[PDB]
Each structure stands twice: as C-alpha cells, then as structure tokens.
Write a protein that binds this ligand. Structure first.
Ligand SMILES: O=P(O)(O)OC[C@H]1O[C@H](OP(=O)(O)OP(=O)(O)O)[C@H](O)[C@@H]1O
Ligand SMILES: O=P(O)(O)OC[C@H]1O[C@H](OP(=O)(O)OP(=O)(O)O)[C@H](O)[C@@H]1O
Ligand SMILES: COc1cc(N)c(C(=O)O)cc1OC
Ligand SMILES: [Mg+2]
Ligand SMILES: [Mg+2]
Ligand SMILES: [Mg+2]
Ligand SMILES: [Mg+2]
Lengths: 344, 344
C-alpha cells in the first residue's frame, strides 16, 4: 500500500480494499504520515462515506496501539457512556452525569473521556472541577473500577500515539471520520455502551462497527442534534444486539417525560457544569435531572442487552436510575470517587 | 471566512459562496495555510466537483500573486500550448514540439511550462536538455518573445508563492483540482490556447474558465486519454469562442491522418525526448511528426478564432505547421532560441 494508491481510491469514490484503512491508520499512529497525508485521508474518507468495515479497521489500529488495562480487571459486563461530541449545542455534561448514576445503580462503568473540543467544558474538564482524578494510568483505573465502581480512561493518556492525528483534526476544524473514533476506542474494551453520535449520517456506520465486535450498544442521535438521548424531542437509536442493527425512534413522552427546551440543558464553564452535576446528584428536580435519568436508563438497557424485552428493560432502567439518585447512592458514589483519588 | 466554514461547506457537498474559493487560495498563496489545511481544501474541492466559477477564483488568485510580464510586451494574439499532464501515458513532449512549430509559423507563443510530475520528462526538462534557458524572468521572457518569437514561462519562476501548495501536491501524490491550474495561470495571460486536459470530466470546467475570460481556446482530450489532440482515435474538443463553449468530436482521419498506435508516441528521459524533438524538426516522417503537426495546427486554429471558419482554419493550420517544419524554419527557430539564451 501507499498514500497515492489509498488517496486515489478514495477520491475516485471507491471503498478501500481490505486492510488499506488499517495500513493508513497504522502509518498515522507510528508518526510515519505527513500532516498533509493525514488530512487528505481524513477528508477523503469522510466525503466518500466511510463503511463500517473501514471505520472498524481504523478503531482496531487505535486499540492495538492503546495502553490496555491489566488482565482480568475489567468485568465482562462493564459499560461505557460516551459520545462523539461536536453537536454544537453547549449542554451540561450529560454522559458524565449519566455514567455516575449508572455506576451507583451497580453497573460497572469504564468511561472513555476527553476535554472539550468545540464546547466550553468536556466531561474530563467537569470531572476535574469536581475533584475527580482524570489522569490515572491503567493500574489505577482498574483500582478505581474495583473500589468505587467506575473508572475514567482519559483518552490522551491511553492513546499517546493518536497525538499526530489529533493535531491535524484541530488544524482543519471540520468534523471527519476521525470524530467517530473516541467512542469506538475505549481501551478497556467494554462490551456494552450508550454511544452518542452528533452526525446523523454516520450513526449507522458506528452501530455497524459495534455489531461486528458483537457489543450490546445503543447508538443515539437526538433529533434536535444532541449526541445524547434528548428530552426536547424524539431521538434516533441504532440498537446493536446479537451482531445486528435495528433502527428505532425513541420518544421520552412514552415514559411520562415532559418536553424540555434546549435552553434548559445549556451548560457553561467547568465550574458551572460541576455545579450542575452537584445539583442533579443532590436531588434537584427539573430538565437536567430528566435528561440524566433518561441517559442513565439507556446505558442500563445496553447493559441488559448483554443477555430481554425493550419496554421492561426501559422501565427497569428508569426505575434503577431514579432510585440511584433518590437514595443518595449517586451523590455518595461521587464523594467516594473523589476520596479514592485523594488517597493515591 | 475560515477554514472550518469553507471545508465544512465542501464536505456537505455544496458549492462555495462567491469569493470563498479566492479567500482559501489567497491564504494558501501567502503562506498562511497549514499543510493540513491546504490538503483538506485540495481534496474536498476535488471530491465536491469544482465549478468553473470556483476554478476561476483559484486561478485568479494565482495570477494576482504571479510575476507579470512588462507592460505592452505580450502581443494581443499570443498563444499557449499546454496541458494538465497526468494522462499516465509517458509520450514525447507533444505540446512543446507543437509550440516550437507554431512559433516558427509566425504565431507568437508564450508557453507556460514545468518539469515532470508523473512522467519521465516534462516539457521544461526536454527544453533544458535541448539547451534552452527555461528559467528566465519577466523582462527576458518578453525579450525572447520579441526576438525569437517564443517565450517560456517556467511555472516555479513566475509563481514562487505557490511553493506551499506544490509541496502538499507532491506529498499527497493524487490528482486534485490543483492539477487544472497550470494551463489556467500562464503569467503572460495569452488570449488563445490549445489546452490539453487529462481529466475528461473536468475539461468542460477548464473550458468554462477560459470562456469567462473570453479567450479563444480549444480544450482537448484524446479519446484514448491523452491530454493532447491524438492521432490514435477521435478527440473531444471543447471549443471556446465568443464567451461560449461547444463540445465537439474531432477525427483527424478527415484530414488524411492515418491511425497511429499509442506505443508509437512513447517517450523516455529528457535526452531521449530531446532526440525526438531533433528528429521531428529535422524532417523525419512518421507518427510523431503527425501528432506534432496536428497539435500545431490546433493552436493555429485557436489563434485564428481570435478573429474565422472551422474547416478552412484547420486546413490552413495544417499547411502552415507542415511548412514550418519542411522549410527548416522550426529547426532554425530552436537553434536561435538556444543562441538567445547563451547571449544573455
Ligand atoms: O466540545 P465537543 O467537541 O462538543 O465535545 C463534547 C464532549 O463529547 C465527548 O463527551 P462525553 O460524551 O464523553 O461527555 P459529556 O456528554 O458528559 O460532556 C467529548 O470527549 C467531550 O467531552
Ligand atoms: O509529468 P506529468 O505528470 O504527465 O505532467 C507534466 C507535463 O504536463 C505539462 O505538459 P506540457 O503540455 O506543458 O508539455 P508537453 O505536452 O510538451 O510534455 C506539465 O508542465 C509537464 O510537462
Ligand atoms: C506553479 O507551479 C509550481 C510553482 C512552484 N513555486 C513550485 C515550487 O516552489 O516547488 C512548483 C511548481 O510546480 C512543481
Ligand atoms: Mg456525551
Ligand atoms: Mg453531549
Ligand atoms: Mg502537453
Ligand atoms: Mg501530454
């Protein structure tokens, strides 16, 4: 393989041959690709329309180069709650709040996360503002998971070889196929997840990648644009179970949720978003709580799918998420997580 | 304007707003664009499918930044004979030979040229091997045109600000919209031309750019793939006249030309191709001569179009081209051109 061969195939609007996307990603990850070649590749794949085979190859290479967690430290039923970002709506950190609630409900959570790219505060920024240690290595993330019930894998910490691609992504600004990779590259390789996708046209491709590795995942795109399950309107869900993908539309009104306005989910800086987390975990009722409970429930549904029915699953997920907040378990879990980090 | 705005519009498969392509190109030309931004733009513009308006904006900015020729030194009726290159065929230098013949016939020629990109020897390489000074500046190109009847504008000498774009093009090694710009950016701005296009689906776009300038141009694509008028089969001609374009099919058999095989036009390195020039100018009969005469006649037809009827124009062009060789005028012009460069 060579860059002219691969780039020419893509600019001819052709799918790549098996192995070519992987070759390309490996050149990028080993520091062997010129910034121009990285940019050409990211753009050309995006404009061709990436296939699940192609995106799976890219994610596979990233996972090969990533720092793994220690053997036998990640429960077989661990779940992720993470999105692509890039929805261009400055919301509170819904996945991060959902993940705390899910862990408090007793589902092991290994969250893949990062600082902001286009927003004012990313999940990692907000966790740091809450006093949680974001920058732990493999051994300590495994300890966090075992001791607290949740671990946070900071993407730059676990994927140092991605630094060459990350730099090009910033210079060009435009979203590309690379924006799909964060949720597909959790170094703990959890088999379940609630996965947000800001890009309606690419959510099915993400779902195809998860289907190929036989994950139990709900890939979600709010019909208002959010890379979360929204409360302002319906959401599209690509449901991944038993190696296949089912496209569904989801309406929170079927579970008694009132419609919110997008303004009601608005975020601010890390300090403001930390305050918002504290408010929800402390039992504040209102729009943000509703969105957190909904997303926590979706992750619990994904976790359930590792084994059945859609409606009892949602009912159970919503019951469990709501109780995790109401009993104070979620608030207490955050306190315990903070304490864990301060004790080395 | 910004890179995220323009690249986002392209990746959404939308034509640019008026001025945006020009903004991007000026960023590239002033050294304000990162190699990643240059590459993203080149690829995204190519995959979107560039319009004549957009290509014209790109060429306009190049011309703005180019070294011009001194005032009143280029005749109103000067002609160019130049192609995009990249036809993947490795032929002798047909445009460069045709240009010498056209000048010897009395039509002023200001040829835009460059070294090999994908071929074994570019027109500039072959001229250098023949002893012609290829890198003269504006004042001396103007002198060459007046004194010898032909001038050669070396693209890197006249477009120094293009160096950043040129570096990215080499790195990505795939054709893009930038491959169209050579024939569209002759710094002497001749109003007539025989312009070869290797990319059949972009020839109409190049023709539209020339139409906007009200040039008299034949944009040509050999139906065998050559970016020249071919002798192996028919050619498609986009005839540009009176600010409008007509697509025609051209068969040189109508002028008595025997069908050649593509292999009979094969070139080699600069020394081999220089030998091929000497052979044609010395009066050797055969396929190469035929191709040179046909293309010289095409350029004469384009020159006639500044004023002209189609079939008589071709018959006249063929007569004048053949006579320029047969009298030794073309051989003598080359010798005079070599002397000119040696005498400062
Ligand atoms: O600034 P953006 O480009 O829009 O990115 C917003 C967030 O998207 C991902 O968030 P994640 O789902 O992990 O967390 P969140 O929903 O709690 O913010 C990403 O790592 C950022 O934290
Ligand atoms: O090496 P390539 O990738 O195929 O492209 C290079 C050839 O295309 C142009 O040819 P021009 O028409 O000016 O000259 P020619 O036809 O005499 O070679 C260009 O300036 C090079 O000479
Ligand atoms: C317009 O064509 C060119 C302009 C240039 N400046 C350069 C360069 O600086 O290497 C190369 C070019 O084609 C190879
Ligand atoms: Mg999220
Ligand atoms: Mg979000
Ligand atoms: Mg040519
Ligand atoms: Mg050619």
């Amino acid at each position: 393989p060579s860059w002219p061969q691969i780039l020419g195939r893509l600019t001819d609007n052709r799918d790549l041959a098996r192995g070519q996307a992987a070759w390309a990603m490996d050149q990028i990850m080993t520091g062997n690709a010129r910034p121009a070649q990285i940019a050409a590749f990211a753009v050309a794949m995006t404009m061709k329309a990436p296939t699940a085979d192609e995106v799976g190859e890219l994610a596979g290479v990233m996972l090969s180069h990533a720092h793994p967690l220690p053997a036998d430290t990640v429960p077989d039923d661990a779940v992720d709650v993470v999105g692509t970002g890039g929805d261009g709506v400055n919301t509170v950190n819904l996945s991060t709040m959902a993940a705390i609630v899910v862990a408090a409900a007793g589902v092991p959570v290994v969250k893949h996360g990062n600082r902001a790219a286009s927003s004012l505060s990313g999940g990692a920024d907000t966790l740091e503002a809450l006093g949680v240690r974001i920058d732990l290595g493999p051994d300590l993330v495994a300890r966090s998971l075992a001791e607290v019930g949740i671990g946070f894998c900071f993407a730059p910490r676990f994927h140092p070889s991605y630094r060459h691609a990350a730099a090009v992504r910033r210079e060009i600004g435009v979203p590309t196929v690379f924006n799909l990779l964060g949720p597909l590259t959790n170094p703990a390789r959890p088999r379940a997840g609630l996965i947000g996708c800001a890009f309606a046209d690419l959510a099915e491709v993400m779902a195809g990648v998860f289907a190929a590795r036989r994950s139990s995942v709900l890939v979600v795109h709010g019909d208002d644009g959010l890379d979360e399950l929204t409360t302002t309107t319906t959401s599209t869900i690509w449901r991944v179970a038993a190696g296949s993908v089912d496209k569904l539309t989801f309406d929170p009104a079927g579970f008694g949720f009132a419609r919110a306005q997008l303004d009601q989910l608005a975020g601010g800086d890390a300090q403001a978003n930390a305050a918002a987390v504290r408010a929800v975990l402390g039992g504040a009722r209102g729009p943000v709580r509703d969105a957190v409970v909904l997303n926590a429930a979706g992750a619990i549904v994904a976790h359930a799918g590792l084994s059945a029915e859609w409606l009892p699953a949602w009912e159970e997920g919503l019951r469990r998420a709501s109780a995790a907040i109401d009993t104070g378990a979620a608030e207490q879990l955050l306190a315990r997580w903070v304490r864990f980090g301060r004790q080395i």
